[PDB]
Amino acid sequence: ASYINAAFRSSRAYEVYFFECNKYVRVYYTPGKTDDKILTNLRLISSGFPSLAGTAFAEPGIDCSFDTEASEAYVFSGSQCAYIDYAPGTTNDKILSGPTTIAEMFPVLKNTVFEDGIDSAFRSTKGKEVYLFKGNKYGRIAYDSKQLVGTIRNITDGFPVLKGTIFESGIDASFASHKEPEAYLFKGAQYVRIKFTPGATNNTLTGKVRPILDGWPCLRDILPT
């Protein structure tokens, strides 16, 4: 069974987009409570985002994503990526850059562990940084300069709080919360909420590692796939 393959934080307060294969939902979420609700019922990506129809991002779907600023996000499908405006509340979504390869979008990533795919990503509170995860490795990109910030290390070199959890070996999906500096990390059937600390190993777990459907019961009729 499969769960969440990608996520990103909307410009709209307390909205999140979740991608599952070739489909997605938009959820109005509630930190610390099982009061999340669906705003967009399970829909093909190609329907929600006609700009993506006929691309890898629609079929087989989006396998990594992150929000940047405004109503912009990067989306990924295998080695391909695109910069989009997801234009909430309208039909004005559009591709701003690409589709192209990861290495062409972000030349600093050419020849790195990220060039053939990214597993997960989320927006940092530090500047324009975005966390990138691939296997048990992670780095940070500043989206606006496209600079790799530092080096690509083990997840637990940045996030020792995740030692002894399955997240130490990789993350399937993630997004930054509207409640800063929290983030949600997903791995198969499970998730955890963290408070992250850029440049420090002061990150905390907010609660326990638990099944997604326990914390997000509004998803129980659509997951797993």
Residue numbers in the entry: 1 to 225
Study authors write:
Here we report the structure-function characterization of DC25, a protein from albumin fraction of Dolichos. The analysis resulted in identification of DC25, a 2S albumin homologue abundant in legumes. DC25 was characterized to be a monomeric thermostable protein. For the first time, we report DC25 being a plant origin oxidoreductase having peroxidase activity.
The structure of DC25 determined is at the highest resolution of 1.28 Å and provided better structural insights. The structure shows three monomers per asymmetric unit. Each monomer has a β-propeller domain, typical of the hemopexin superfamily proteins. The β-propeller domain is formed by circularly arranged four blades around the channel perpendicular to the plane of the blades. Each blade is composed of a β-sheet consisting of four antiparallel β-strands. The central channel consisted of four innermost β-strands of the blades, which are arranged in a parallel manner. The narrow end of the channel is lined with acidic amino acids, while the wider end is lined with basic amino acids. When the monomers of these proteins were superimposed, it was found that the core β-propeller structure was highly superimposable between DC25 and other three hemopexins from plant seeds with Cα RMSD values in the range of 0.32 Å to 0.54 Å. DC25, being homologous to CP4, LS24 and CAL, shows significant conformational differences in the loops connecting the outermost β-strands between the blades. Out of the 7 conserved water molecules, three water molecules (Wat428, 455, and 520) were present in the cavity whereas remaining four water molecules (Wat429, 437, 487 and 519) were buried and exist between the blade interfaces probably designed to stabilize the ß-propeller architecture.
